[PDB]
Amino acid sequence: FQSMSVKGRIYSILKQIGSGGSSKVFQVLNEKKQIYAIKYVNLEEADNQTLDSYRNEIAYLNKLQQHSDKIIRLYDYEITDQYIYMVMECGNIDLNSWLKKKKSIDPWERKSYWKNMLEAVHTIHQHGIVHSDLKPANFLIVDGMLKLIDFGIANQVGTVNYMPPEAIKDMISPKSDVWSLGCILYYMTYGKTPFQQIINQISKLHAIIDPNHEIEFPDIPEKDLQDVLKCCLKRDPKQRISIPELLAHPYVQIQ
């Protein structure tokens, strides 16, 4: 019932997809009736540090568009001293909500999603970006294909489930993203994150950094998938598999 203007183009508001303390995301329709997601950011209470973080991510988002299609499209944007309007690709659902709604996962769908995650994270790394906060919520399903929604640059629940040992110790290299990605795959495999069973946050963090605390990897018909999980989950970042190595792995390459 409402409408908005971005770069002299008019958009009809359908609904609010998401909300933030200073931001909101809306599902909208353009003049040709194409559907988009518009992210609205309010800059009234934003300090200079916050503004540079927002500007930096937008610049990386705009630049990386060309490099991979596994990164959400940023069609256009309007930025003033008061607000930011970003016209972007509209997804179907985030990977967190999708995994929560679904009981079992297809092996083919899982592999397909893993490849997409690897391609999106590889792309940011090539540009010197390490997300450091990967979670299923950072991924969006668009046309049966996963897309990275953010780069971790802009100022931002803060779950510790996908947090690597080196991030807990430091209170961080591309290998940090490998651990988080592994946790996601682990969830996609076993239906829970490696330390989901540990309810107390302090007891949980200790386990993640505990060498003795053994991560269980129950036997599954996909041995390649079992190996990826063990390779991603090595506590020592130096013993952990890299993204380029994950791309040449049998799990993503063999039929």
Ligand SMILES: c1ccc(-c2[nH]nc3ccnc(-c4ccoc4)c23)cc1
């Ligand atoms: C479900 C459906 C669509 C989107 C979405 N598609 N494109 C988006 C661009 C920026 N932000 C979101 C978002 C984040 C939380 O709520 C919406 C986007 C996200 C989740």
